[PDB]
Amino acid sequence: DHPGLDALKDVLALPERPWRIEGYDNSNLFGTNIVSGMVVFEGGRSRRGEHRRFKVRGLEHPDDYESMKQTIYRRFTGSLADKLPLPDLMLIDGGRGQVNAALDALKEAGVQVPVVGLAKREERLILPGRYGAQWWLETGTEVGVDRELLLPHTHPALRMLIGVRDEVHNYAVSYHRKLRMLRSVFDDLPGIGQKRRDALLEHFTSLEDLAAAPVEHIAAVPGMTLRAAQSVKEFLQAR
């Protein structure tokens, strides 16, 4: 019995139970290391032996959209495309910009895989079109409101996707833990001090992600104040 998977199928209008789910994120927190995580779920259970780490290359400046687009394109072309089974559903740890990046890569790869996003630091689902996770549908019955779905926190479809996010975020946290005699990209933030600098590393994925985030998300970080959050916002968008 798979409550979460069955709910996903109905809620995202999938053609069948999503037995294979792949989760993706992207960070650049230490030096020039731009890294994308891929986590694999089969039958609603993580398969850690199948997780993968993509080193993003060819970028001379960070760019979260291009970082996600390259990862997805890599995943659905060459060797991996040949070797790996297509997921039934891809989960993007990212808002609309990161969902767009995934769809862009899929279109360029010539592949049709259903996609849904989770808005960073929120529980809002981001849908890739109007008709659910199958973003290539031209018509059908509308899913969600303005291409988003808000579900109660304990809803089984939501808890499942939030578990995939937790797994990919944790995989990121593990890698950055290892990387840490290099300063973090947040070590240049003024007005906040070193306890708050380090608290941001858990909640944000890159200078770009921090800079675009509502000041309210920054202030909600434990250890932060509306004040230190205004200070970060102002410094990054000064540069």
Side-chain angles (χ1 to χ4, degrees), residues 213-224:
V215 81
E216 306 93 286
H217 284 212
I218 307 185
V221 172
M224 292 295 291

Side-chain angles (χ1 to χ4, degrees), residues 7 71 147 229:
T71 298
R147 312 183 318 155

Side-chain angles (χ1 to χ4, degrees), residues 2-19 21 89 132-134 143 157:
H2 309 287
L5 297 175
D6 288 334
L8 283 168
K9 179 228 186 263
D10 292 331
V11 143
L12 302 173
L14 302 170
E16 56 208 328
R17 211 142 85 158
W19 195 254
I21 303 184
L89 172 63
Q134 301 179 105
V143 170

Side-chain angles (χ1 to χ4, degrees), residues 44-56:
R45 298 263 198 21
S46 81
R47 324 184 50 95
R48 319 171 285 129
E50 287 184 61
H51 297 350
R52 293 177 177 271
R53 193 137 36 218
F54 295 81
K55 307 183 193 184
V56 171

Side-chain angles (χ1 to χ4, degrees), residues 19-197:
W19 195 254
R20 182 178 175 98
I21 303 184
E22 295 176 3
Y24 295 86
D25 76 354
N26 182 230
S27 25
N28 171 38
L29 284 182
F30 288 83
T32 67
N33 295 290
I34 303 180
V35 159
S36 300
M38 171 184 160
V39 301
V40 178
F41 281 67
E42 229 79 321
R45 298 263 198 21
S46 81
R47 324 184 50 95
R48 319 171 285 129
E50 287 184 61
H51 297 350
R52 293 177 177 271
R53 193 137 36 218
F54 295 81
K55 307 183 193 184
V56 171
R57 272 170 211 173
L59 313 187
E60 313 171 17
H61 277 322
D63 179 341
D64 287 339
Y65 166 99
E66 290 287 350
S67 286
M68 170 71 61
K69 186 186 175 189
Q70 187 188 110
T71 298
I72 300 307
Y73 182 75
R74 286 169 65 193
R75 155 74 179 83
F76 290 105
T77 55
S79 181
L80 294 171
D82 193 76
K83 197 192 298 161
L84 310 193
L86 292 169
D88 295 305
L89 172 63
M90 306 175 34
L91 172 72
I92 291 302
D93 177 353
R96 166 78 51 207
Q98 293 286 280
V99 174
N100 289 156
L103 296 205
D104 282 351
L106 292 168
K107 285 171 186 186
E108 286 189 4
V111 321
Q112 287 183 344
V113 176
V115 168
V116 68
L118 266 164
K120 283 295 196 179
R121 290 165 295 271
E122 286 192 70
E123 288 184 348
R124 205 159 52 120
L125 293 161
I126 297 324
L127 295 162
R130 303 171 55 176
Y131 310 111
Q134 301 179 105
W135 42 269
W136 55 92
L137 297 177
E138 221 78 277
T139 61
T141 56
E142 190 104 2
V143 170
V145 168
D146 305 344
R147 312 183 318 155
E148 295 182 310
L149 261 199
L150 306 148
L151 296 177
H153 178 76
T154 62
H155 193 289
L158 188 59
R159 277 316 297 179
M160 176 64 66
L161 297 179
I162 283 184
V164 176
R165 186 167 62 185
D166 292 338
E167 186 81 16
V168 80
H169 181 54
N170 188 77
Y171 189 57
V173 162
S174 284
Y175 165 83
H176 295 118
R177 163 177 58 249
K178 308 182 188 67
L179 287 193
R180 207 172 175 95
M181 313 296 200
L182 259 190
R183 293 304 162 69
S184 101
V185 295
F186 296 149
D187 285 320
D188 289 335
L189 291 178
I192 72 172
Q194 204 53 64
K195 186 71 153 164
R196 288 173 182 151
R197 276 164 171 184

